[PDB]
């Protein structure tokens, strides 16, 4: 039942990659992945199974190989039963080809071949995961020059399988695409745009169990990735202490080089793509890594892994594990502020915030910055230094003195009348 | 397993109400409750089970109906053996009448009915709930003057059923009572007074199992509900982020027009009925409105629904949320304070609070609220503004400047002489 | 589903002592322990199984009971199965027999004696615990002047049994010794040292399920328990409202006369033995007191026994509640601390800390301490008093005024020029 993944690896000097790490019914993590000895199309890749035992991950069993086919990327994870899935697309015909287990990794049985019909592939990727009496595999498609989101889906318990909804068709090439259920009807979306160069992931939500979908633009943050490369998301669902639900969604970045995660409200999900908060790195990520999978404890904890390049022809897995923290309930951009003003932020909460942090600094994109309490200094005559916080059941007002932050009076970080700010920038966090 | 009712409602323009909301063995949310074509006694109620599918409530099946007599409220929930209860009672009669389904709501099977005996009648109300070996439904009698709260109970899985433990009996007309096993032999009750007119409910406990009750007296909070219509309570358990339990209380006030919860440390509750905090609107609730239920995930987390009314014939189910954030260890009321005095607060908390709050206002009823910090002005002489905090393993200790609150120094909330407050009042909020 | 075991108690006038709390299939707490009318060895000990029931601890079954043999302490817990195992060491034989049962604590089965072999004896001692296939009963045990810390275990769900791991092995007489898996091939161990006098618990660990061990030294916290008497350590898991891991070491003081627990992250918990957090006292324990044990529910919420003499022939299970609140993520030492100065601190989070508190105390063990903001007094010229705070993703900052705290301008705990404190100490606690 405990679980830890700090500094926990994969690697045997294989190309191991493009996989999902879950959980068995009897609590034991899992692997199922890519094993080659090249990345480069049509080479050798078979999908293979290995578990978390001991602290060391097993001698992977084998679940489909075929000389000299190329087993691409392998999507599944745990189903309701426990009946584990996993899918993966030869490379040689486009086909989707669908595994199951039912002994828990041991054996495994061919259930479903995807024909291409008139498309150019199928392409399986992403964790599976289960939509009322459904269990899906996701899966991106080209036809030439149109490209479509669609999911492979079972009713029974995954002995047969059909393609199923219909994410997105049209001109722009969006492949892997993570699907969370949040739920009742409501499932979000984060997908891949192309190569993932520019910066950008676009973000998807169904209220229907995947019967429609919109589109609800690029996700985005007040400091976002530049023009960066960012591949393979994936998401998910927590709760916070007192069940204010969150999103997490987890991304590669091939510029930087790290794999990161950020949040956002699902309140603010549902409204639109806008609302997600500042990234945070969990792991570097040289060239060619990750391909992030989580598996969520206690609504709360969340176990990660990523798959990471050791050279153009080795790579491995490696776990990690997220610590979220209180999540702000409420939180507002950096906003520029000045002295002797009076700030009205509408807080959009249930009940009052019991708890309020203001702090300073002095960019919209700052390395650090100062928590705001109210002081004082003397330059000549009588003056507040930050800020006095009115709470109520609407807004934080915040009153800001003749500096919004400094005094001269402290070592090191606020010594000088050149720390006493007449502006700035403030961010606001709220938890209930 | 994850769930979202932010917004969700059950609405077909039929009279839906009295009922219950619980969660099925498989994750899924049902209601069971009374469906009619009006509210009056001997009009055409029957007792009917929707299932939350894919965010749409299922269109309902049929519990028990019977020309030409009138199912009224709605009791039950979800048993441990994943059978669903759903008890009722004929108007016409006063009789029990008791239905169990084993295949989650697509077939019921009448297994009890309860003759009035002498009693007036037996009115079925309420989440039903385990005690031990037994299973429960509430009910409230009337024999002329005379009103009883009772238990009608099973000890084999809902099988065969029998009046139980009495919970009171006397001249007070308590009906609509909320039970909640807190546990190891603690049960605690919130219950309706009558018509609800007067701004109170009844606190009761048990303390081995419904054996024997004591009459706690009011539920009583700083500030009540004045003389207000307080209808149908409904109770839930949670625990914070470090093991502290509270009890929520929901109800529905029928002069205001909103459902509302508070909350109690379980410590307090079980020493008495004074403790309770703030009421929290989570909903609207017009006229003859709500009759709440919740479903709690993860000790954290309530999902909730209450019926409301859209005329005098015309009703429906409307779901919703809860955040509850972090509930203080230890809150004090809104307390007087003057300047330069000492104040110590007893904290009743296992080790010192890690976390400590001070907040300002000029009444013990306010609608906003200023976070104290210890600050300075000078009117003519140095003076210190707000509060220095002490912190121990037994007591909180305050020390107020010549100010309680205030500067005049900080935009907007705090800018001028006027705003240098002597006295007022204080409010504590420590989380350990 | 809920407990609450604020005021629980089992006693009936025996000599009841030394045995495990914990938790069956269907909810229930129970107990397995040693049942006498002494403690002496060669005394009357029977090992006896109760269940909590209404509140109520049930009239004990006998588990195992001989003339004229005296069972000594009663390790065990339930098996993932939801088989209950007890094991006791016989004080005539120095043998172990091992008991099970399917029906929970209803009928009793004995499955296995340990022979001492070449030893003087094997002793059970403490909560069970699952590593992977395994289950284990911890044994200590002694020939002539070598020590020896074991595992008794089971691969096959407790039908046959067999000495495996062997934790320590040399000529220190450490005993009673606590396992906590952490897990993925990581287990902990706080080992009793001999008589206990000395003030040390023994810290050890495992990365790969009991195969090798590492002696970490021993616990160390800032605040120690000097040389007093320490008994029966027992640890506990549980994590942060965002997921962050720690470890809780509950343990005896026969000194002081109480029961405490301290905490650790097991991050630095798995980098060495200090880094403990201070002492909280849980319980009275007078005389030959306590043998603590745990369940945690929802990995955040503690329940807790131990045994307290009434006299020195009778003695009962006494039951509490852990009240953890939000454990830092990062906290400091009580560290000096002077004037305008500038404190650097390496807070080692996965991000920048959403919350931080800064304290302080004249000394680095103090009784009381105060909340630092960072204030403002005048004896002649301008001075702050208290501290400004930076943070950042790697480091916390400090910058001290004039005065590290106080102003000589708030009642009662800082009224005078007295309370302007140049120097002190400061104690940082960070929260993502």
Redesign the interface.
């Known amino acids: ?6 500094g ?1 690896a994969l690697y045997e000097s294989y190309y191991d990659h493009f996989g999902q790490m879950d959980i068995l019914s009897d609590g034991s ?1 899992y692997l199922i992945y890519r094993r080659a000895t090249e990345h480069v199309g049509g080479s050798d890749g078979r999908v293979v199974f290995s578990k ?5 991950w097993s001698a992977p069993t084998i679940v489909a190989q075929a000389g000299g086919q190329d087993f691409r990327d392998v999507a599944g994870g745990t189903m309701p039963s426990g009946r584990i899935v996993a899918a993966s697309t030869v490379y040689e015909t486009g086909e989707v080809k669908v595994y199951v287990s039912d002994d828990s990794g041991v054996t495994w049985v061919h259930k479903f071949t995807l024909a291409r019909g008139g498309a150019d592939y199928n392409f399986a990727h992403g964790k599976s995961f289960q939509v ?1 009496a459904r269990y899906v595999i996701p899966l991106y498609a080209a036809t030439g020059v149109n490209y479509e989101l669609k999911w492979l889906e079972s009713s029974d318990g995954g002995e047969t399988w059909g393609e199923g909804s219909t994410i997105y068709s049209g001109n722009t090439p969006y492949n892997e695409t993570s699907y969370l ?6 499932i979000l979306a984060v997908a891949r745009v192309g190569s993932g160069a520019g910066g950008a992931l676009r973000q998807f939500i169904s ?3 995947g019967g429609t979908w919109t589109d609800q633009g690029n996700v985005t943050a007040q400091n976002g990735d530049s023009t960066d490369i960012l591949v393979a998301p994936s998401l998910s ?1 927590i ?7 969150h999103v997490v969604l987890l991304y590669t970045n091939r510029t930087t080089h790290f794999c990161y995660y950020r949040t956002i409200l ?2 603010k999900a ?1 409204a639109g793509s806008s609302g997600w908060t500042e990234r ?1 790195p ?1 792991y570097s990520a040289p060239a060619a890594s990750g391909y992030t999978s989580q598996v969520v ?6 176990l990660g892994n990523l798959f990471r390049e050791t050279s153009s022809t080795t790579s491995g897995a490696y776990q990690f ?9 409420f939180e507002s951009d950096w906003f520029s502020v000045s ?4 700030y009205t932020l509408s807080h959009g ?3 009052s ?5 203001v ?1 300073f600094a002095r960019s919209s994109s700052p ?5 705001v ?6 330059d000549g005559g ?3 230094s ?8 609407l807004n934080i ?1 915040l ?4 500096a919004v932050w400094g ?1 001269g ?7 000088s009348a050149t720390t006493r700010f007449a502006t700035g920038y403030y961010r606001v ?1 709220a ?2």
Chains 1, 2, 3 share one sequence.
């Open positions: 039942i405990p679980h830890r993944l700090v926990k993590l978390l035992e001991g602290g060391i009322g259920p949040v739920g009742d009807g409501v209220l229907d169990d669902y709760y916070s202490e007192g069940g204010t639900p699902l309140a549902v945070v969990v404890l206690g609504g709360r904890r969340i594990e997220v610590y979220l923290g209180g999540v702000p309930d002295s002797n003003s009076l909460l249930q009940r915030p019991r708890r309020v942090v702090e390395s650090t910055w100062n928590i309490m109210p002081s004082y200094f003397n009588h003056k507040g930050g800020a006095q916080v009115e709470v109520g059941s007002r009153g800001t003195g003749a005094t009076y402290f070592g090191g970080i606020d010594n966090r938890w209930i």
